[model samples]
Target: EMHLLARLAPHLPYIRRYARALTGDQATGDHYVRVALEALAAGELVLDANLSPRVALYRVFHAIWLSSGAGHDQGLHAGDDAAQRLMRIAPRSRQAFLLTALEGFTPTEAAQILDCDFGEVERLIGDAQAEIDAELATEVLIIEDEPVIAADIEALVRELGHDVTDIAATRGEALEAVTRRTPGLVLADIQLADGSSGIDAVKDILGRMDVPVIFITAFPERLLTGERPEPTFLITKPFQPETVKAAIGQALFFHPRR
Candidate 1:
């Protein structure tokens, strides 16, 4: 049951978005989804059908979104009118539409998850493109003392279409970088070539700005958490390139601590 809920977790935001659109009030929509989830858990809905439990969760959520009296008001739907329109155009659209539109996923891939036609997925994607385009913006900063890692980070950031403003190799360099041109995010190595602790650099930088900081290091946990910084994201050595990029993007975009 726990695993079932875990798998359904990714779809929660879209469900909330849909609920809010139908009800027009965020709080009411959230209540609807919450009740639906509770019912699914208590009933132990079967997964014997061709529809995966995850997809079934979406279907149930749709019914609940419509029937939960959330439809009585449009205030909850304040920011999701476009998504509502997309759902009407593609009744089968679920997390795919929202993830593609709001979270950034290719239509073809989103369709694969939804078990829908590629063309329909593409349309849903294009359906919300304009709305998404208007929200696009911002850059992230990388902090690493090693030349190779710093260059690789730059390449990864470029590949992901986010800016990598400056690379810092030492505590002093990082401090100066933060002071001179603050970045929306920070990716640093815990050990610097200048014999200064990366954590020290991170603390100073954090004091200057509450930007997200991700540490890429080979050292043990002591270097990071002895007296941890306010918001720290750590990537161990030999991590996949994509993982690092995603972590950086996450830190840049998600204000977890705030």
Candidate 2:
């Protein structure tokens, strides 16, 4: 039923983002995501409801890493040099550091699996790790008073192979909210809200978030300023399905990590 997977849906990309950054590789961290999922499926693990889903998701992932052994080491050997001394630092060291800067955790949440230490103090003291929390925030939008735009935007989508799921405003949080398939493409054709910069925070979705958005916008200003790349493809506001179809092909035609 993908019941456990559904729980993981919202924060899914963050874990992919989290574990991949941990290893600095794509599929390696992705493997851990699968492992955690299998653990959940096998009933070896359960997500704690009282905690934030992000933490509960992370908590299980940390457990899997510890048991698997995070990096290479023989344990009995002393440092071959000062470098290995660096290596012998807390096995939890990288794990700890990543959590703080990456997810914006303080010592308390950092200790969910690890106890506080000078390592924590030192990390707090020196590093500028702050803000992926905002980076991962997601939002979904319905731009007009009616279902008019959402109709074709919704219809043509399902008429294609993939279906339109949740419409969140940003990447990480959108995945968190989308709660189903991990959508790699976005169709960003939105109308700007009038009356004092009113509803356009919606770009925070394809505009501000991940993946390539075939930016179909009416704003001549945001279009001319610059582009955020990947989905640099754009179509003017008064466009049609043929235009969007062409954009998706070209964007994913050169798809990199999506």
Candidate 3:
């Protein structure tokens, strides 16, 4: 059991991430995670050596997810526009899209997780992308100290049908930008100009008003602590454009439009 647990440890955090995104909240997502763990302990879930550990773990969680009747109205918040928009999308297509696009799983891997064929996964992905493209456009704020990366992120944001309100290199600048106009989304880095933390800037902004944030950082492990309610939208440093797009989509998909 110790050996099995050791193998499962690395995949647990991401499993929690998937569950949270699936359910659109933390408590219910963690509940499903606990259920999956309990199933493993009770011998109801047999880990397949033929598959990789991450794939096997996801398979187990997917089973519990389906058996528990998740992916229904129970997981979404009542009267939330973002959650309502998600509910309107085709059933199970969002899951396939999230798995392959946002969660960085390959179509083949996502098919295994969803228990479907590769061709069907691709079709579902296309449908999901169409659904996301239909959402209303909004403004975004970029908070990064680096000029090159900031420009790259700005270009990506524009390509996603969002306007860039402003780019801030320091915490003070970020605060100032928010004061002028609260953007619909914030893409931030951990370290900033003038030695301040982007996390602090984001907290301050959230304190003042509501907005969705995506933290792009080199140290993903630091934020994935599971110690408290953490941000679900995160991008690793030196990220792919597709990764940024997917993260932005997932963040906006859950953001409450007030």
Candidate 4:
């Protein structure tokens, strides 16, 4: 006697991460998770033991996402077409993105959730990223000393369709940039080449005009990367492209018009 339903219980938190990421709001995302769980409890959605628990639980959420009337449409079409019109990427592209990048699932695994070919998943990810970057375009500032790291970070920033205003290697340089003109956003490292604190530079910049920042630090206990950063904006050293990509979107998405 086995309860397949009980097996899915362990991954509740993980699926909730996707829910929150997918919906772009923790309350609504969590609400969707609740609605999804209800469907499982009612036997309206079946959980089989065959698939990976990770994938299996996601299937339930995906079902809720696509359904027309479930839990009385509590989670689906909550606002109707007005929201979709404002959404930059199509639903399919966004899902494929969250599935791969946010969930850290391979294309093979994501295909099952999207119920499509592996190639299609790849294309969706590519397209979704491009569209999102396009929508969130802005001028960016970077404050870091290391050439190699700054090079990579700037590449990632530019890759996201954001232009870097300056790479301030020291505190004074940052002040200089802010004087000339404050960029729309900032990416500041914890430490600078000349031993100037990046935080101080940002503090001074904030004094002049308000701007969002993504703090980067290497130490684990110090400014650790967060699952949600609206504005640490911290991305640890040796950060993955996906982490940077997600943080940029998160910051700007919550960010008001510049």
> Which residue segments of model 1 deviate by more than 4 Å?
1-39, 44-48, 52-109, 112-117, 126-139, 144-149, 160-163, 169-173, 184-258
lDDT (10s digit) by residue, model 3, range 148-224: 88888899889888889999888878888888988888888977766667757557656456677888787776665
**TM-score for each candidate, following the candidate numbering:** 0.44, 0.38, 0.82, 0.59
Q: Which numbered prediction scores highest in TM-score against the true structure?
A: 3
Collision count for each candidate, in order:
7, 9, 0, 0
**Model 4 residue 154 lDDT score:** 97
TM-score for candidate 2, please give it. 0.38
Candidate 3: 10-residue stretch with minimal lDDT: 67-76
Per-residue error for 151 in candidate 1, Å, reads 3.1
The local lDDT score (0 to 100) that residue 218 gets in candidate 3 is 77
Candidate 2 per-residue lDDT over residues 126-181, each given as its tens digit: 43223111122212222222245546555555444444655543333344543444
Better of 1 and 2 by lDDT: 1
* Candidate of highest lDDT: 3
Q: What clash pairs does model 3 have?
A: none
Instruction: Assess candidate 1 and give its TM-score to the true structure.
Output: 0.44
Off by over 4 Å in 3: 67-90, 193-195, 199-208, 256-258
Per-residue lDDT value at 118 in model 3: 90
User: RMSD for each model, in Å, please?
Assistant: 9.3, 16.8, 4.8, 6.0
